[PDB]
Each structure stands twice: as structure tokens, then as C-alpha cells.
Design a protein around this nucleic acid. Structure first.
Ligand SMILES: [Zn+2]
Length: 463
RNA sequence: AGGUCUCUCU
RNA sequence: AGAGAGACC
């Protein structure tokens, strides 16, 4: 991704997009009970903790673009993945606006508390005044579609969330690039059936884990991913995508039978305009963060990427022996023989991709079931039933979460959610967690799940 | 203040 | 179905 220009909103004629300036996160009653280093992300250029210019840091993620058109390896990768997708029989026909607005079995209805985007946010029109769940009304929608059209700018807001200390010093807050309601609708109409298919079929046919539930999906993954594992991390995956990967996405969509009218929506993703505060800017390459379908297209692109990297890096790769699942940039993959990611990362650099070892060290060490992580969780076989696999979230990350709150009124829900994550680490660690919670008066006031009930509820998911 | 999953409350 | 929360990407 690369920013092509920046202009004042007077010159472009766009309405200003202002976002909140102060965090909703304050220390919780557990802030001193548990260790942690994270704090709310810098949200304002005048944050005292900054040690860099804020807006420079905000847009450094756009590292540039290298390739613009597919080479042989990317072509073969794209075609191999699309062929794999054929066995899913995706309905490449346009989904209805009513289905696209109000939802189906495998596609959530448009969230009515998520923003409407440009220009609706600026001119006060609310999503509640245009869509009605009881009515399944597309009347006003069709109007505002005709009124404001498509290819509207994405509205840029900084994300209010915890971040590590180095990321606060360095200004590295994350951005939400919220699509406009009209483009959500058009994208959900064009690809909603594909979204349905992916959501219902997390695994190694889609190559996607969007829609997975880790409590149950973890037990499938060692069977879906036989052989030797490989994985690695990206730095700034979304922002580092060169336009070649959106060309490659077009290859995939066409080969599984999408119309050229549908395939043509991809250039509107590759080339996007954003309003942040009082400025407009153009972005060439790079996936927009808050687009309808961001995770699914990131995940498909990743399937193209891993295949290409394999067949360009090594001789004799049989892509039919690759197994992988991606959630956006996060990837876990396997192959009958070990894969050297040091060499994959070298090839990745040529494509404009920055790939680093999965263990966060400087060396690409072996990835096995005992150290692999996906969606930040490890893999722990149950002591009683070793075919059942616990997704294990590090207590360190749960410790960081519980030290802060956005509304202390829901302390109960917050602690319960963390408990549903924490018990997978075992009885002793869980009871150490609960004891620490209860060492504090608000802690003795909470209904806290008992470990044996958690375990039994999880076992029952498999019967 | 984008999605996915999970939980909670009418 | 209506309101909320948390985690992850
Ligand atoms: Zn432009």
C-alpha cells in the first residue's frame, strides 16, 4: 500500500470526519492485582507519551508497493486456489438487497450500532432511520443508494484499545477505515453468498477460519493440518499488500465464475480514498480495514500468497499437499516435508511482504503443535481425552485485559468472558486466577464460573 | 469506534 | 427478536 496524495477537504469537497479524542479505558479495580504493561493507544497528536510525530506514525504502515501485475507463480497460485474453491459451489449470483441488509443463516444482518460511514455520519442520518428489522425495508435504502451512489470515501478513525508500551511511544495506533453503508450493501449484494459459504465452512477447503469457534475448531486442526507445520508473522500485512494481490484476487473470482461486473469491484478496493479529520487522501494497494468483507478477502489473498511463495521459493512443491487456514493475516499451514520460512520470508520481501518468525525471536525456529499459535491461542491436548484440543490463551494476555475497563458497570461480564478463555490453561492456573480476582472486595461480589462446570460444558460440545 | 466468535440481560 | 460486554483478526 502507498499513499498517492493528500489534499485539504476544501480542495476535494468532502465533509470533515472527526473522531473521539480521549480513551474510554480507565484502570479497573483489578489494575494493581495483576501485572501488565499495556495502556490505551495514543489517540491525539498532543498525547504527552508520544516520542514521535503522531500522524507520521499513523500512516507509516503504508510501506510502498512493489509488483503491480501477476507473474507466473502468482498466476499458478491463484488458479490452484480457485480450483480448490470450486468444490464449494459458491453461488456467484447477486444476493438480494433484503438478504444483504437484514441477514441470512450464515450472514449476520448489518449491525445497526456500527457506523453508517460517509456521508451519513457527517449529516446525522442514522442507520436506524433507513433500515428496519421488523419491516425488512429496502425502500429508503434503494433511494439513498441512488442519492449518494457507490465508491464513497472510507472514514478513518483511530482505534481505542490497549497497546504495548513501545507502540505508544512510537505512535503506532491502529486505524478503522469504515466503509460507507452504500458500499457495504453493494459488496454484501455482490459477494454475500460467498460470505455465507466461508462463514459456514471454516477449514482447509476455504483456507479460512473466519466464522470458526476455537472451543471446537481446535480439535479439528491437527487433523486438517497433517504433516509438518509452518507459520510466521507479517508486519503490517493489510497495508503492505501491493496491487498485484488484488489482481490475483480478480483471477480467483473470475475463475470460480463471477461476472465481470462483480470482478470489477476489486479495483475499488485496491484504489481507495479516505477522509481523516479535515483531509482527503488516496491509497493505492493495501486492504481497507473496515470494509465489508475485509477478513475474508485478506484470508483469500493469503491463500494466494502462501501458494505463490511456496512454488517460487522451492523446486518440486506439490500444492495439493499444502494444507492451510488463514484468518486475515494469521496463518497456520502444513506440508508433508518441512518448509523453511527463512527462505519463504526472503521470497516474501520481493513481493513487498515483511515476514518474521512465529516465536517472535529473530530465528525462524521449528513450529510444532507444542508451540504453534493461531488467533493468539496455543494447542493443548486434554489430559483425559487427548483427541480433544484446548485453545490456550496466555494468562499474560488475560492479565492485561482485566486491568482495564471501558464501563465498570459490566465488570461481571468482562470477568466471566476472561474466565471462559482462562480455564483452558488448566485447573491450577484457573484457580490461581480466581483467587487473585477474589482478593479484592469487588472480586468477592462476582459470580465466577466454576472450573468443573466449564470443563463439562466444553466436553458436551463434542458429546 | 470494521467483521468473526463467545457470553450476559430483557 | 431487542440491549450490552469480552476476546481475536
Ligand atoms: Zn485516488
Amino acid at each position: 500500500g502507498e499513499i498517492q496524495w493528500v489534499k485539504p477537504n476544501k480542495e476535494t469537497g468532502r465533509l470533515n470526519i472527526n473522531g473521539p479524542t480521549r480513551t474510554k479505558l480507565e484502570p479497573s479495580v483489578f489494575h494493581d492485582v495483576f501485572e501488565g504493561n499495556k495502556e490505551p493507544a495514543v489517540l491525539h497528536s498532543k498525547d504527552p507519551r508520544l516520542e514521535v510525530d503522531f500522524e507520521q506514525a499513523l500512516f507509516s504502515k503504508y510501506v510502498g508497493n512493489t509488483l503491480y501485475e501477476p507473474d507466473e507463480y502468482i498466476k499458478e497460485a491463484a488458479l490452484h486456489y480457485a480450483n480448490q474453491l470450486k468444490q464449494l459451489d459458491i453461488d456467484t449470483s447477486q444476493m438480494s438487497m433484503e438478504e444483504a441488509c437484514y441477514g441470512t443463516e450464515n450472514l449476520e444482518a448489518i449491525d445497526l450500532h456500527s457506523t453508517a460511514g460517509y456521508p451519513y455520519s457527517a449529516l446525522g442520518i442514522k442507520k436506524r432511520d433507513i433500515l428496519d428489522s421488523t419491516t425488512r425495508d429496502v425502500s429508503k435504502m434503494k433511494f439513498y443508494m441512488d442519492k449518494y451512489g457507490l465508491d464513497l470515501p472510507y472514514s478513518t478513525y483511530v482505534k481505542d484499545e490497549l497497546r504495548s508500551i513501545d507502540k505508544i511511544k512510537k505512535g503506532k495506533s491502529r486505524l478503522i477505515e469504515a466503509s460507507s453503508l452504500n458500499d457495504s450493501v453493494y459488496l454484501r449484494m455482490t459477494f454475500g453468498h460467498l460470505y455465507e459459504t466461508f462463514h459456514a465452512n471454516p477449514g482447509t477447503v476455504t483456507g479460512s477460519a473466519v466464522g470458526c469457534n476455537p472451543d471446537t475448531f481446535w480439535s479439528k486442526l491437527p487433523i486438517l493440518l497433517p504433516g509438518s507445520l509452518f507459520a510466521f508473522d507479517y508486519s503490517g500485512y493489510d497495508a503492505s499488500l501491493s496491487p498485484v494481490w488484488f489482481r490475483a484476487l480478480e483471477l480467483v473470482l473470475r475463475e470460480i465464475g463471477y461476472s465481470e461486473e462483480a470482478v470489477s469491484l476489486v479495483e475499488g478496493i485496491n484504489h481507495t480514498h479516505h477522509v481523516y479529520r479535515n483531509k482527503t487522501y488516496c491509497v493505492l494497494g493495501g486492504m481497507p480495514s473496515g470494509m465489508s468483507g475485509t477478513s475474508i478477502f485478506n484470508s483469500m489473498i493469503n491463500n494466494i500468497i502462501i501458494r505463490a511463495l511456496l512454488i517460487k521459493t522451492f523446486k518440486g512443491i506439490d500444492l495439493d499437499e499444502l494444507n492451510m487456514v488463514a484468518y486475515g493475516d494469521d496463518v497456520l499451514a502444513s506440508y508433508p516435508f518441512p518448509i523453511d520460512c527463512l527462505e519463504l520470508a526472503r521470497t516474501g520481501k520481493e513481493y513487498g511482504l515483511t515476514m518474521t518468525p512465529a516465536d517472535k525471536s529473530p530465528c525462524f525456529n521449528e513450529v510444532n503443535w507444542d508451540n504453534a499459535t493461531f488467533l493468539k491461542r496455543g494447542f493443548l491436548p486434554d489430559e483425559q481425552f487427548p483427541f480433544l484440543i484446548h485453545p490456550t490463551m496466555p494468562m499474560k494476555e488475560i492479565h492485561e485485559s482485566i486491568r482495564w475497563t471501558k464501563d465498570a458497570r459490566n465488570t461481571q461480564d468482562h470477568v466471566r468472558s476472561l474466565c471462559l478463555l482462562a480455564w483452558h490453561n488448566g485447573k491450577q492456573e484457573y484457580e490461581k486466577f480466581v483467587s487473585a480476582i477474589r482478593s479484592v472486595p469487588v472480586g468477592k461480589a462476582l459470580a465466577i464460573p466454576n472450573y468443573e462446570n466449564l470443563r463439562r460444558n466444553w466436553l458436551e460440545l463434542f458429546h
